[PDB]
Design a protein around this ligand. Structure first.
Ligand SMILES: COc1cc(/C=C/c2ccc(O)c(OC)c2)ccc1O
Ligand SMILES: COc1cc(/C=C/c2ccc(O)c(OC)c2)ccc1O
Ligand SMILES: [Co+2]
Ligand SMILES: [Co+2]
Ligand SMILES: [Mg+2]
Ligand SMILES: [Mg+2]
Lengths: 483, 483
């Protein structure tokens, strides 16, 4: 394959496209013998060169990595998420879909097809592996064989066109809670709220509209509510016609937080929109209720964090204003005005990729993990450099940091509970480490509440993973692997 | 897996064990559209840590790499050669066989099993892929699926215990010509000569004895003769009982060249042994007859080339005396004495891994390729450093060199003929290049008689191959791949 000689395809961003199997990877330390299950993660990875001769990282085809941990060892199985795009381009031997979220650049032969790369999350629910991309229904796969099933439209009960890559699981019911924005077509202001039973059936689909179309990448869920931030990374057909990236950031638009009842009978009038001054937030650590209030914790930045989705008025990217810090947004459903109740920075540590013990989804909670950017650490070989694992204790305020060293960077952590009813945070953290000087990757295993001593086990891969997005652990009994 | 922290298992020698599939590898330059077939090669690669807690490179399990070149692109498929050793240890989840060629160190549960790692050649013949190791019958595999069949004993017609890793194909008949030393048991002085028809049937097996047991790794074949050098890398049960490496080099023993008739009715008395002073030679570029004379071209060194098979009298390894240079050994079957007719150095270039256009096997020939060690080139990051591809023209004497640069090394080349009846050397050379600074490998494609301009195509693998031994190209129609 002849790939472009541009930053998105060279160095750490070289195409990999490895499908492989390796049991009993070389490792150091002690893999806890309690672990019996697998950690799934996804990397964008282009099957074919881009039609345009350049592209962005978020547009690569989804390649799924599974780390099966059992009997004190770690195995890897890596397979493509065989979206309709993947299958059509594989059959044609060339790229047919074009630029990111831009149907105007597709070959006429794929007009009207789902454009999904399934490249943003690898999630486990209802016995299936979900390979997810927010512009289409989710792909599903067999979590044991990692064969692909197809797109999940819930027996025709789903009429929205899209499905999130950030599903939540409500611990009170076991339901998956999801959204789908641009639900009636590209750049529309319609959004769907979905709840899926543990058995994989769509319980309900509720439609509503938002203040303006924008990237609704993540959200929060509480007992009673969908918690939906409205942040002005905006897109338009006009932008696409002019050849611009789909999204661009508008510093002049307000930010909203919508509180949407989790009810099949939802009506537009039941929603409250709270309003604040312009800022940037993408991911949600967790949300929960307290009396008549709703709290949501997000990494907040002063300005845009996506340099490839540039300032719509032509401003150059500002790296310092892109620094995000975990911040609690509080709104009161009994308040008179549309103002936030409070905005409170929870740490001075800069970070992203926030995670929790997911059994606390929607509940008051004590622990949060993040990828941290410590600009004061040496780097002995641009972009965001995520060089630490970070743990925050909301009860005492204590913070823990682990630095991966001067030639490495880190990918998103994932929490593994010790058992169904273990206390919050009783378990382990796994995460990929980019060993940039060795052009390879490790899987690190930490004791989740004691990270400053470093990982208790380091699993070496004999090749490099690419930049990853989101990933999750599932116990073996949830994914058809051995007891 | 917990592997030892020793040189044979770290750095470039880290275990890999990757089984994978990747079509349409990222590449540069122009892959000739004439190419339709595959290049097979093998790397020792340990499935499990060694029982002893250390080992040598030559004892790793055979991992087979196939580069399928077609339609101007290159695909890779890599699979284990599933020897009986591989299968037994896989089932047990641990190493059961011990040190190199040392049955005294095996677990009692595998007493009497073939110890083969099938790690020395990946050869194509009679529609099968041969994964070869000189201490046992050859393994065979499906060249298209790269599944394993098992050990080839030719319907019971083979009674020798061993089969070479350096088979030759006689262009006059299409027969495979092979030997098997230590044919009646470990360290015995019996050798078998085998010829196999193009249909895969054993034509004949002829037994004889050699002057002393030693590593009979390679050999030559002419129209009338097996040409067998006797070089004193010797082994013994006594060495094994004392815990020494199986082989050690004895500088005090003579070197012989045996001329053995290629005949099923062979008798010991039909053999001529020519004798010369001590030296080291392992591989054979080619052998051929001229009147009553036999010529064989080998890389000759003053002393031992295997530091892990040390001098039997305790001398430290001598790197300078291990430098090998292509040398023609000539003997005359009509001569009165046992002296060589001539010993003539053919180049001052130091090199090994000699190859020819294999259609000239056993015939007078013009071209030879080697891996070259140019000690005068910069190395910007011990062992042999093979840093050039080398081509020798026996007709004019001309020499060509291509240097892979200061941070790379090279593996064995293989010649690809343009067509069945193209002139000698009309075709291409393929070879793996170790990109040591990038911790990855390339496959290089050269115009076979014009190498100084560099490869015409460079295929990038997104991971590193390990040290390889021998490999071969086969046209697609010979290995069940598409026309
Ligand atoms: C600062 O917030 C982060 C965001 C992201 C990516 C979001 C994302 C959005 C849309 C996509 O279509 C997509 O597809 C791959 C990805 C990654 C890391 C972060 O820290
Ligand atoms: C200097 O001659 C060379 C020899 C070799 C290896 C021979 C070999 C011998 C016995 C084995 O059992 C084996 O198993 C892996 C390998 C490799 C490169 C060279 O240049
Ligand atoms: Co995300
Ligand atoms: Co050899
Ligand atoms: Mg269904
Ligand atoms: Mg047979």
């Amino acid at each position: 394959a002849h790939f472009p000689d541009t930053p998105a395809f060279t160095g750490f961003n070289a195409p990999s496209r490895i499908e492989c199997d390796i049991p009993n990877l070389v490792h150091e330390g002690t893999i806890p013998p309690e672990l019996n299950g697998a950690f799934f993660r996804v990397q964008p990875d282009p099957q074919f060169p881009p039609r345009l001769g350049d592209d962005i990282s978020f547009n690569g085809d989804g390649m799924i990595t599974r780390f099966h941990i059992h009997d004190g060892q770690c195995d890897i199985k890596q397979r493509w998420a065989k979206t309709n795009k993947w299958k059509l381009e594989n059959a044609a031997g060339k790229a047919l879909f074009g630029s990111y979220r831009n149907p105007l650049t597709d070959d006429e032969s794929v007009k009207g097809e789902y454009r999904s790369t399934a490249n943003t999350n690898a999630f486990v629910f209802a016995g299936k592996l979900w390979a997810m991309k927010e512009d289409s229904p989710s792909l599903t796969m067999d979590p044991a064989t990692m064969e692909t099933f197809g797109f999940e439209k819930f027996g025709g009960k789903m009429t929205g066109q899209t499905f999130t890559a950030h599903p939540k699981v409500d611990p009170l019911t076991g339901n998956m809670v999801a959204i789908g924005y641009a639900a009636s077509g590209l750049c529309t202001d319609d959004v769907c709220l979905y709840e899926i039973s543990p058995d994989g059936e769509l319980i309900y689909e509720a439609w509503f509209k938002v203040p303006y179309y924008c990237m609704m990448h993540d959200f929060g869920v509480t007992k009673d509510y969908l918690v939906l931030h409205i942040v002005p990374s905006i897109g338009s057909w006009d932008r696409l016609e002019k050849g611009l990236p789909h999204f661009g950031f508008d510093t002049t638009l307000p930010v909203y937080l919508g509180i949407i009842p989790r009810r099949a009978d939802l009506k537009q009038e039941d929603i409250r929109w709270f309003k604040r001054e312009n800022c940037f937030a993408s991911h949600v650590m967790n949300a929960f209720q307290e009396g008549t209030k709703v709290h949501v914790d997000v990494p907040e930045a002063e300005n845009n964090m996506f340099p490839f989705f540039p300032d719509v008025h032509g401003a150059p990217f500002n790296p310092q204003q892109a620094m995000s810090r975990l911040t609690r947004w509080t709104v009161d459903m009994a308040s008179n005005s549309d103002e936030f109740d409070s905005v409170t920075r929870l740490t001075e540590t800069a970070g992203e990729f926030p995670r929790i013990d997911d059994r606390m989804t929607g509940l008051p909670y004590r622990y949060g993990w993040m990828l941290e950017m410590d600009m004061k650490r040496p780097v002995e070989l641009g972009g965001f450099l995520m060089n630490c694992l970070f743990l925050k204790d909301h009860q005492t305020g204590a913070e823990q940091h682990w630095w991966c060293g001067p030639t490495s960077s880190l990918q998103e952590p994932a929490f593994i509970p010790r058992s169904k009813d273990a206390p919050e945070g009783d378990g382990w953290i796994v995460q990929v480490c980019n060993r940039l000087a060795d052009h390879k990757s490790d899987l690190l295993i930490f004791e989740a509440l004691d990270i400053e001593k470093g990982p208790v086990a380091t699993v070496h891969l004999p090749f490099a993973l690419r930049f990853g997005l989101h990933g999750n652990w599932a116990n073996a009994e949830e994914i058809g692997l051995a007891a």
